[PDB]
Amino acid sequence: IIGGEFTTIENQPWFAAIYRRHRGGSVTYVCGGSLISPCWVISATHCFIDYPKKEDYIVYLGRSRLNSNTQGEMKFEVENLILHKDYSADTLAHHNDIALLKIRSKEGRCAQPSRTIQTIALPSMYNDPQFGTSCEITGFGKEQSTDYLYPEQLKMTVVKLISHRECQQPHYYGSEVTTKMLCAADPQWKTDSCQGDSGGPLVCSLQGRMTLTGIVSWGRGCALKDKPGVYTRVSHFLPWIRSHT
Numbered sequence: 677i678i679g680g681e682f683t684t685i686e687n688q689p690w691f692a693a694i695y696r697r698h699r700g701g702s703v704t705y706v707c708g709g710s711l712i713s714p715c716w717v718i719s720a721t722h723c724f725i726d727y728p729k730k731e732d733y734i735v736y737l738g739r740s741r742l743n744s745n746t747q748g749e750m751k752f753e754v755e756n757l758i759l760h761k762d763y764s765a766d767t768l769a770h771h772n773d774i775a776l777l778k779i780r781s782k783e784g785r786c787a788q789p790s791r792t793i794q795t796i797a798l799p800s801m802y803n804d805p806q807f808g809t810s811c812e813i814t815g816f817g818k819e820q821s822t823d824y825l826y827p828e829q830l831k832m833t834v835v836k837l838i839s840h841r842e843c844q845q846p847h848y849y850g851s852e853v854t855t856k857m858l859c860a861a862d863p864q865w866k867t868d869s870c871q872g873d874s875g876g877p878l879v880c881s882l883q884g885r886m887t888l889t890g891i892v893s894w895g896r897g898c899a900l901k902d903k904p905g906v907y908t909r910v911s912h913f914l915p916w917i918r919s920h921t
């Protein structure tokens with residue numbers, strides 16, 4: 677997250693931290709995700725497509741820091757890793773960039789909700805907020821495009837939904853953005869998602885309820901003028917989600 681503010685998991689209790697085990701033993705951060713039911717985390721396919729073996733991954737819920745344990749956190753193995761069959765990537769865009777992780781503990785349990793661990797509601801079909809609506813994004817991604825390190829503390833920021841009509845402008849993304857994507861950005865371009873925020877939540881208030889509107893997917897750079905964050909449009913994938921859970 678470029679700009680924004682540091683936060684703790686209580687603020688975004690559905691946020692899932694996804695890591696990969698390396699051949700050799702080291703464990704590195706991969707991507708964010710969102711808990712949509714006790715046994716299911718939703719994320720982005722591009723996070724896993726290189727290393728698509730479920731045994732390689734560790735998922736934490738209730739975790740506020742990248743490389744230290746948070747009191748009350750829970751750790752899971754990935755029982756199922758479900759990537760979208762119609763995934764495709766070009767130079768920039770990732771199409772159908774959505775993935776489901778079924779989580780199970782060593783002792784065979786799913787998430788136990790708590791102050792730090794809660795599910796997020798999915799939107800109703802083809803129902804998104806109007807453009808200009810402020811939404812929140814959360815993650816452990818880079819604080820500056822040029823940084824080598826990820827932040828140790830979770831962050832969040834606010835971005836505003838941009839219309840399909842504005843996003844498709846040539847100086848924005850042209851035809852790279854589809855109707856199954858959403859664009860969001862800061863009016864000054866000063867705050868944004870970045871590398872390591874992929875798979876995390878874009879959350880909007882929809883009919884007086886915090887709702888998973890988008891999943892962090894791609895962008896050209898981070899916090900660059902005329903280059904919004906692009907998000908998988910969750911309200912266009914409900915049959916896929918319902919079917920695969």
Ligand SMILES: N=C(N)NC(=O)c1nc(-c2cc3ccccc3o2)c(N2CCCCCC2)nc1N
Pocket residue numbers: 821822868869870871872873874892893894895896897898899903904905906
């Ligand atoms: N909100 C956005 N505008 N953009 C995004 O969400 C986004 N950006 C980048 C991004 C591009 C970039 C270029 C130079 C330096 C750092 C960079 O990070 C990104 N990476 C991070 C680069 C490593 C491989 C993974 C792709 N993923 C995103 N999902």
